[PDB]
Design goal:
It is found in: Nucleus. This is DNA polymerase iota. This protein is of the alpha+beta class. The protein folds into four domains: 133 residues, Reverse transcriptase/Diguanylate cyclase domain (Alpha-Beta Plaits); 62 residues, MutS, DNA mismatch repair protein, domain I (3-Layer(aba) Sandwich); 77 residues, 5' to 3' exonuclease, C-terminal subdomain (DNA polymerase, domain 1, Orthogonal Bundle); 108 residues, Dna Ligase, domain 1. Helices cover 42% and strands 21% of the residues. It is built from 13 helices and 14 strands. The strands form three sheets. A six-stranded mixed beta sheet has the order 6-7-1-9-10-8. A four-stranded mixed beta sheet has the order 4-3-2-5. It has a four-stranded antiparallel beta sheet with strand order 11-14-12-13, with helices on one face. β6 and β7 form a beta hairpin. α4 packs across α6. The two termini are 36 Å apart. It binds thymidine-5'-triphosphate and magnesium ion (2 copies). One magnesium ion binds next to β1. It binds a DNA duplex through α9, β11 and β13.
DNA sequence: GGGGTCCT
DNA sequence: AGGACCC
């Protein structure tokens, strides 16, 4: 019934770097964060470089790999919002997923375009891009026609993104978010594909690991592996009763639906972010004097970002990670502090954060943090 | 890794 | 405050 598109930018961070320094769009490029190559351009993947590879592995496997540092997300974040703002011009309800993916519900727009078409030009309606599984099109099938118009809009989207932002990316068009997202990566990079309904099963069964289904992550997949469940079909087939009584009703019914390619979740308007955070990770921080300096650094950046935003946060959170998950402490931001932008908001915010710090770190007893993070949320 | 979302 | 998910 619905016509949903999923847009997915090509090697996002690397693409941004290649644009900032066009002297790089010729070379294999990797974006580095500490010891990780979080992503690389397609010249690099040709040479054996994979996403999230160790710089050691990447170096050895590709000594001519140019590395740029991508620990500061400022520019990626800015381009990211330019992308969704551009998509919002097509339809106001755009849902972000991470920095480089967006869903848009095109069905109202598709409907509008059809109501305007004439008889002799419905003939006549064509696909833009790939048709998944080379499935043949039936122009008399109104579902095929709607999905085809979807593909046309999707191509207008990719064209605008290139023309206005210089950004290249993939699109997937299908009847729900799950399927749009699975199909958008079938032809990469910088291409698009549309999923006709009779090819839905082929798409879901094309997956080789149950983790490949968006919504099934490390923990959930590990549990399923424990239950003898490894293929999509194993999950499709497993006893709903037993599944429920091992993962709970909510998860069980949702992921089991997902395994059939069913996903009724609406595309949601993401809008402005609901939180701003900054982190730094390190081998060791073992003194409060360090912690405070670290935190002042993080807080400085955040205050810059809150500044531009316009809205004001009403709670602060401090996150740590002890040597060998994470722990957090939050509290509301005093009413008087919330009026800042010209004054000196630093010293009182660091005072609050340090109270939070000592609340979860015994400073009289040696400690070994390996991450510090500050988060502003409850924006108003 | 350096972010972000929602649910319990 | 933690846990799970997504990138
Ligand atoms: C998965 C993941 C992505 N990212 C960032 C790096 C990526 O540039 C960006 C989007 O990730 P992806 O969309 O998963 O991959 P990509 O856009 O870099 O490359 P492609 O889609 O062509 O395969 O998010 C992280 O920082 N940490 C992570 O764990
Ligand atoms: Mg991408
Ligand atoms: Mg998954």
């Amino acid at each position: 019934s619905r016509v949903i598109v999923h847009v997915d930018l090509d090697c996002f961070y690397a693409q941004v770097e290649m644009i900032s320094n066009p002297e790089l769009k010729d070379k294999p490029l990797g974006v580095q964060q500490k010891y990780l190559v979080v992503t690389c351009n397609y010249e690099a993947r040709k040479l054996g470089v994979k996403k999230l590879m160790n710089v050691r592995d990447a170096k050895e496997k590709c000594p001519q790999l140019v590395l740029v540092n991508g620990e500061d997300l400022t520019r990626y974040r800015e381009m990211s919002y330019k992308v969704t703002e551009l998509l919002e011009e097509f339809s106001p309800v755009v849902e972000r997923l991470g920095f480089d993916e967006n869903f848009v519900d095109l069905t109202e727009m598709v409907e509008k375009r059809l109501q305007q078409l004439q008889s002799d030009e419905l003939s006549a309606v064509t696909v833009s891009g790939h048709v998944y599984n080379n499935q043949s099109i039936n122009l008399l099938d109104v579902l095929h026609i709607r999905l085809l118009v979807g593909s046309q809009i999707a191509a207008e989207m990719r064209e605008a993104m290139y023309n206005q932002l210089g950004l290249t990316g993939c699109a997937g068009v299908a009847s729900n978010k799950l399927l749009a997202k699975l199909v958008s990566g079938v032809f990469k990079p910088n291409q698009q594909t549309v999923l006709l309904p009779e090819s839905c099963q082929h798409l879901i069964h094309s997956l080789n690991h149950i983790k490949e289904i968006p919504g099934i992550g490390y923990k959930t997949a590990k549990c399923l592996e424990a239950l003898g469940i490894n293929s999509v079909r194993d999950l499709q087939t497993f006893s709903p009763k037993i599944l429920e009584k091992e993962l709970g009703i909510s998860v069980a019914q949702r992921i089991q639906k997902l395994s059939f390619g069913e996903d009724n979740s609406p595309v949601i308007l993401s809008g402005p972010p609901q939180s701003f955070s900054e982190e730094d990770s390190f081998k060791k921080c073992s003194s409060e004097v360090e912690a405070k300096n670290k935190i002042e650094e993080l807080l400085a950046s955040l205050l810059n970002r809150v500044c531009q935003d316009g809205r004001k946060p009403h709670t602060v959170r401090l996150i740590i990670r002890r040597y060998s998950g994470r722990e957090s402490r939050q509290c509301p931001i005093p009413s008087h502090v919330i009026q800042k932008l010209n004054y000196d908001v630093m010293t009182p915010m660091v005072d609050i954060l340090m109270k939070l710090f000592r609340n979860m770190v015994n400073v009289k007893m040696p400690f070994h943090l390996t991450l510090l993070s500050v988060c502003f949320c409850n924006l108003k």
